[PDB]
Each structure stands twice: as C-alpha cells, then as structure tokens.
C-alpha cells in the first residue's frame with residue numbers, strides 16, 4: 051500500500067479502476083472518489099467543528115446509468131448501505 | 147474455609163489506604179450519617195491488596211457476596227455503638243455497590259460459556275417499566291394452631307413456605323402490616339446501532355436491580371454495566387438473563403432540566419474576579435466566536451440574550467417574558483449557521499432543531515398515547531424539552547402553519563396549550579429563540595422592501611427585538627482578511643493557540659463561562675433606575691416623529707421595540723451583576739439598536 | 749465420560765477401574781443400540797451396569813456393590829435382553845455404627861477399629877450402645893483437642909449432640925460411658941499408636957506433663973498468655989477511634 055501510494059500519482063489509476071460497470075465518464079467518478087475516502091474533521095479545541103467526510107449530488111436524464119455505480123459502491127465499500135425510499139428498500143431512512 | 151476469606155475481606159475495609167488517607171472507612175462513617183446503608187466500591191483496589199478473594203469471587207460470586215454483606219453489617223454494628231458512645235435496634239444488610247473499567251464485552255460475542263460468572267459490557271437503554279416489589283421479612287401465623295413464626299429472605303429479589311408445622315397442608319397466612327418488602331424493576335438493554343451487521347434487527351436483554359441501585363437511569367442514557375449471567379425459566383430450555391452487580395452512567399447525558407444548582411465555593415472567587423473586571427463585556431465579545439470574524443454588533447447581542455432579563459410578575463398574572471427574541475437574516479456564508487451550531491455547546495440545557503420539526507421531533511408537543519393500557523401521556527416537545535433555555539432554529543422559512551402558530555405564540559407569552567379530546571394542557575415553554583434566514587436569491591432585498599423574502603411580512607418587524615441585515619458587499623479585502631483569519635485554523639492551530647494565550651491573558655474558556663452563565667441566570671435580582679426612565683422615552687418619541695415622515699413618504703415601529711431595550715440594557719448591566727442601571731450601557735443600547743432602525747429604513 | 753468415571757469411582761465410597769469403565773461403555777452401548785431397551789431413566793443407569801461388569805472381568809463381590817424395586821427388574825430385563833441403654837440385648841452392624849461414627853465426619857480407620865473391637869468383643873454384652881458411645885467419644889476427645897484447646901465452647905455442644913442422638917435428658921450415664929471404656933481399652937498398642945499420633949495424654953502434652961509431675965516448678969501452667977496473642981490483640985484497640 052505505502053509502496054504504491056507514494057509512487058507517482060496513483061489517482062489516475064484510481065479513476066481508471068473505480069467502477070468499470072460503464073465506460074461512462076471520468077469527472078463524476080473523480081468527485082465520488084473524493085467522496086469515498088473521507089477527509090479529516092477537527093474542532094478548534096472542541097468548537098468550530100469542521101466536517102471531514104464528503105458529500106455528493108448527481109442528476110440528469112434517466113437514459114444514462116444513474117442507479118448502477120452506487121450499488122457497486124455498496125458492494126465495494128466498508129460499512130456501506132443500499133437503502134432507498136418507499137418500495138424495494140431495506141429501511142425507511144429514519145429511526146423509529 | 148469461609149471465615150478465613152471473611153477476614154481477608156474485612157481487613158480490606160479498615161486496613162486499606164491510598165494517597166495516605168483512609169478511603170472506605172470514612173466513606174462508611176459518612177454513609178451512615180447519610181442513613182444510606184450502602185457504599186461505593188472499586189474492585190481494581192482489591193487486586194494488589196489481596197489475591198485470596200479475586201480468583202474465587204470471579205467464578206463463584208454468589209457464593210462469596212452475601213458473606214461480604216454480613217461482614218459489612220458486622221463492621222457497622224461496632225461502629226454504630228462506638229459512635230453512640232461518642233455522640234448521641236434495627237440495622238439490616240447493606241446493599242453493596244461496585245464498578246470496574248477492566249474491559250467491555252458485547253452481547254454479540256457472548257455464548258453459553260462463562261455463565262454465572264461476571265461480565266463487562268456496553269449498550270443503550272429502553273425500559274422504565276414499574277416498581278415491582280419483593281419481600282425481605284414477612285411474618286406468618288397458622289390458621290388453626292395460631293402458631294406464629296417468621297421468615298426473611300436475602301438476595302434473590304430456593305425455598306417456599308413451610309409445608310407443615312392436624313392443620314393439613316397450606317396452614318399459613320402471610321401477615322402484611324408487620325412484614326417488610328423492597329423494590330426492584332425490570333431493565334432492558336440493547337447494543338450500539340452503529341456496531342451491528344448491515345441486515346438484521348437488534349437483540350436486547352433484561353436485568354433486575356434492587357433498593358438503592360434503583361431508579362438511577364432514564365432511557366437514552368448510554369451506560370456500562372457489570373453483572374451475573376444468571377438463569378430462570380423448544381425441547382428443554384431456560385431463559386438467559388443477568389443479575390446486576392454494578393452500574394455506571396455517564397454523569398449527565400441528554401440535558402436534564404433537573405440540573406445542578408449548588409455550585410462549589412472555589413469557583414466563586416474567580417467568578418467575582420470576573421464580576422469586578424471592567425473588561426467583562428469586551429472579553430465575552432472576544433471569545434464567544436473566537437474562530438469567527440466581524441459582526442461584533444451581532445455577537446454583542448447574544449450576551450444580552452443568554453442572561454435573560456426581567457422576570458416581572460404582577461398580581462393579575464400578566465407576566466413579562468423574562469427573555470428576549472431574535473432573528474438573524476441573511477445570505478450564504480456570513481456565519482449565520484455556524485454560531486447556531488456552536489451555541490448548544492456553550493449552552494447548559496437548551497435545544498437545537500431544524501424546521502418543520504426534525505426526524506421524530508415535534509417542534510411542539512406532539513401528544514399521543516401509551517403502548518400499554520392505551521392511555522394519554524404528554525410525550526415531547528422541542529419547545530418544552532428546553533424549558534428555561536434557548537432554542538436554535540435554521541430554515542425558519544418552510545414552516546407548516548399549524549407548526550408556526552404555537553411557536554408564534556411562545557415568543558410573546560411562552561406558554562403552549564393543547565385541549566384535544568380528553569386531555570387539557572397548559573404546558574409552560576419559558577424559552578428564548580434563535581432564528582435563521584433564507585433570503586430568496588440572496589442580496590437584492592435591500593434594493594427592495596423590508597420583506598420580500600416570505601409571506602410573513604407581519605411578524606418580522608413585530609415579534610423581534612434583534613433583526614439585522616447581516617452582510618458586507620464583497621469588499622475586496624474583507625475577503626482576504628477573513629480568509630487569512632480562518633485558514634490558520636485547519637493546521638498550525640494558531641487561531642487556537644491565540645485563544646490559549648488570551649485565556650492565559652484575559653479570556654475565558656467554554657465551561658467557566660458556562661457556569662458563570664448558569665449562576666447569574668439563576669442568581670441575580672436586577673432592576674433599572676427611575677433616572678434611566680426618560681432617556682429612551684425621548685428616543686422613542688423622536689424615532690417615532692422621525693420615521694413618521696420618511697415612512698409617510700411611501701416607503702415595524704412597535705410598543706415592543708420600546709419595551710425591548712428596557713430589558714437588553716438590564717442584561718448588559720446584569721453582566722456586571724447590577725441590581726441597578728445607569729446610562730453607561732444605555733448608550734450602548736441604542737448604539738446597537740440603531741442597526742435595527744437603519745435596517746428599518748432599508 | 750465425566751459422569752461415567754464419577755459413578756464408577758463411586759464404588760469405593762489396577763485392572764478394575766480400566767476394565768470397568770470399558771465395560772460400562774460398551775454395556776451402555778449395547779443397551780442403547782437396539783430399539784429393545786427403553787423407559788430406563790438415566791437417573792439410575794450405571795449401577796447394575798457396574799454390578800454385572802463386576803461379574804464379568806474376573807472377581808466379583810456381592811457385598812458393597814449394589815449398595816431397589818427396578819434394580820431387580822432391570823437386572824432380569826437386561827439379562828434376558830442379552831432410652832438407648834435401658835434397652836437390653838440390642839443388635840448392630842458394620843454400617844449402623846459407621847453411621848453413628850461418620851456423623852462426626854471422623855475417618856473410616858478409627859471406625860474400622862471400633863468395628864474390630866465390636867466383632868471380637870461384642871460377645872459378653874449387656875448393651876453395645878454404651879460401648880460404642882464411649883468409644884467414639886474417646887475418639888473425639890483425643891483427635892479434637894486443638895479446636896477445643898482454643899474453644900471451650902465445644903465441649904458443651906459435643907456432649908449435647910451425643911446426649912440427644914441417643915435420646916436422654918440425663919447425662920452422667922454418658923460420663924460413665926466414657927470412663928468405663930477408658931478403664932477397659934486402656935492399654936492396647938493401637939490405642940497407644942493413636943495417643944502418640946494425636947497427643948492428648950489426658951489432653952496435655954508429654955514434654956509438659958513430665959515436668960508437671962516429676963517434681964518441678966519450671967512446669968509451665970500457662971496462666972500468662974503467649975506473645976503472638978498480644979501481638980494480634982493490639983490490633984483490636986489500634987482502630988479504637990471508630
């Protein structure tokens with residue numbers, strides 16, 4: 051891991067190897083690659099918190115692959131989830 | 147033998163010491179003045195002193211425990227008479243208490259091994275069922291022989307009544323009025339939902355407790371516990387349960403209105419050093435938002451606010467709202483969300499919400515009924531959770547009308563009422579409010595009317611004593627100033643270390659000021675001077691006649707903004723612990739309100 | 749296998765133990781293989797198992813092995829499948845007085861000695877309750893001198909025990925029960941061996957009494973107390989503050 055991480059800019063090969071489900075496109079793969087790792091949170095002595103973890107939002111016409119790579123990510127992460135709204139869902143996205 | 151172990155145990159009572167001071171000896175001497183009939187214990191303290199009890203209390207605990215109880219009672223009996231001989235019949239067994247921190251093992255990694263041993267663990271609470279009772283000493287008379295007897299039971303709150311003392315079987319009545327009992331409850335538990343498999347529902351477990359180990363806990367309180375994996379009753383099977391022998395709670399998880407009110411004495415002296423500085427106000431303004439830039443005038447209101455104001459009652463009941471109400475208003479950036487994130491931290495017992503109510507959160511009292519007996523109970527409220535506190539809101543824009551109404555009533559009387567079918571409520575809110583805005587497409591509102599954000603043009607300039615356009619129009623250097631103010635946060639900790647060296651100087655950290663706030667919030671007895679009366683009646687009539695013209699020009703004013711500075715001035719003087727007031731801060735008063743009238747123009 | 753070794757090594761209470769655990773194993777095996785042998789509670793199922801396994805190997809012993817309704821049934825079923833002293837002239841057994849001696853949890857060797865005494869000299873009697881009473885009393889006073897030497901609360905509890913185990917309110921007869929056997933059993937080499945073992949000699953040591961009685965003043969009548977006594981009594985008043 052360290053050998054390859056330090057040797058000459060892995061990240062092109064990250065987005066080359068993220069999700070070959072669709073050939074698709076590199077940009078949103080890169081966005082969600084940032085979404086994968088999570089950053090670093092901190093607090094200024096326990097106040098003025100900063101969020102280390104990353105968010106994303108995609109959108110566009112349904113004709114293209116929108117509900118594929120996220121389930122792939124569910125298959126690929128650690129402690130991921132594929133929840134959903136109503137219908138074909140694990141849980142209702144709340145607590146109760 | 148057993149008495150060897152009893153002495154190996156009882157020497158630990160009075161012949162143990164650390165940091166050159168007796169610990170448990172005088173602990174008991176105190177507990178007996180408390181009339182407590184119990185103690186506290188650590189078991190870490192027993193490992194070095196002695197190894198003749200640990201490895202056997204481990205695997206045969208119930209065999210060893212009531213021994214300790216009796217040893218304790220033995221120590222009690224001497225010291226009772228000795229202290230009666232010193233100064234100034236019925237002494238039961240003392241519940242023992244203990245704790246530990248050696249480890250925590252989860253419910254998942256259990257098995258049917260190490261059963262009846264003692265285990266350590268984590269989890270989350272649900273149950274507060276009922277005070278179910280048991281017996282400890284109960285007298286018996288026979289119905290024919292009239293043959294009195296007696297029974298007492300010890301731990302298991304093994305045998306039954308006597309089958310024969312002709313009287314036949316079951317000859318015995320249980321007398322109550324000379325019998326004795328104790329309480330327990332049935333307490334549940336379930337694991338951390340964050341440390342679970344992706345798929346399945348969770349597994350819970352029951353437990354039982356006794357006299358003074360009762361009623362310590364209320365749900366949601368994450369707690370660690372140690373107990374004995376006991377048993378009671380497919381093909382042939384018995385139910386697994388646990389017997390408590392140690393509980394430890396976080397001191398105070400979710401904020402309890404029944405909080406601490408009797409502070410220590412050492413803190414008074416630094417409190418009053420901070421009472422008597424002239425720099426009080428300026429320090430608080432330098433420190434409420436140390437990683438935050440400008441808007442000094444905005445940060446200069448919060449201190450007027452958190453300290454409340456003139457709780458004043460009159461012989462009809464028309465109280466005046468002791469606190470004040472506020473409304474930020476402006477754009478992205480400009481720290482309108484970050485302070486609100488912060489304020490709960492500095493806060494002792496207040497609450498935060500989004501709008502519409504949050505997930506499973508009634509923005510007011512969302513009453514419903516009982517899972518059992520189908521009965522009525524007042525459940526919740528984001529406006530009554532925080533009784534005697536502030537409330538923080540973001541996205542005030544998208545209210546529901548029914549949601550907006552009661553909150554719209556609180557900020558002028560702070561008392562909700564619900565009178566649905568059977569239940570009739572008057573539940574006291576008694577809270578302060580922090581708002582937050584969503585300007586439609588941002589900045590052009592200053593070019594436009596006061597409003598033209600949302601369709602409450604009424605309540606804005608009516609129910610609010612602090613309303614501010616919160617922006618600067620992209621000065622090319624303020625950007626760089628705030629950027630370099632803030633970039634040092636993320637590493638180098640120079641913004642943090644400056645607060646370190648300034649608290650070493652004249653600043654205060656989070657909790658010292660928290661306690662200062664709590665203390666003055668409940669201590670002071672403010673008032674204002676007759677001399678200070680006219681100073682602002684003049685200001686009032688002048689601002690009235692002034693904007694009469696400029697608002698008659700075809701471009702709000704209230705008795706409430708008149709009545710508001712009445713209480714803000716008292717707050718800023720309150721900071722100095724001021725049972726009176728002078729112009730010293732009345733000048734700052736309109737110095738800070740003028741921002742509101744400037745906004746009132748535009 | 750635990751329970752097997754348990755019940756098998758319950759017989760005492762070289763090739764024997766081995767062959768008998770093997771026997772019970774393959775016996776239980778044969779008995780449970782077929783569908784022929786059922787409604788046999790495992791409560792009791794390793795006993796005439798053990799008795800016939802005694803019958804098999806080489807030597808068998810009718811006594812002390814079976815030690816009842818279904819005992820016979822299952823046997824055939826498997827075997828096909830394959831006051832006290834006014835009472836004049838009473839009678840006793842080995843295990844009757846093993847009980848009356850084992851009530852004090854005394855060892856079995858002393859009991860066997862009283863048994864030998866009996867079965868040789870139970871011939872010319874009037875009442876053996878007296879003889880065995882006195883016997884086991886003078887076993888207790890000789891072996892239990894330590895606890896009594898430090899606890900004189902014992903001598904009342906013990907005599908009360910044997911006063912009502914044999915159902916009397918009068919007791920001086922028991923006093924006679926002791927001194928007469930002591931007159932009788934006074935001088936046998938085994939009695940001698942016990943007195944050198946547990947060291948009463950009227951309840952007092954040798955190296956003391958000989959100077960008590962030869963003619964001395966160095967004789968230590970311990971009116972005074974020993975040093976360790978005070979060394980430990982001091983702790984009681986150390987914490988006198990409380």
Ligand SMILES: Nc1ncnc2c1ncn2[C@@H]1O[C@H](COP(=O)(O)OP(=O)(O)O)[C@@H](O)[C@H]1O
Pocket residue numbers: 072074111112113114115116117118
């Ligand atoms: N570029 C692509 N290559 C292969 N399959 C695709 C591609 N784009 C879309 N699809 C198929 O069409 C579907 C698009 O579904 P999607 O738009 O995610 O449904 P929804 O909009 O309801 O989530 C996918 O399930 C995918 O299999």
Ligand SMILES: Nc1ncnc2c1ncn2[C@@H]1O[C@H](COP(=O)(O)OP(=O)(O)O)[C@@H](O)[C@H]1O
Pocket residue numbers: 437438439477478479480481482483484485628632
């Ligand atoms: N006035 C300010 N000075 C320094 N940093 C700020 C200021 N306002 C916002 N930030 C920073 O920008 C980020 C955005 O938060 P914020 O602007 O409060 O939310 P919103 O933009 O939704 O109102 C935060 O991480 C915060 O630290």
Ligand SMILES: [Zn+2]
Pocket residue numbers: 288289290291292293310311313317
């Ligand atoms: Zn009766």
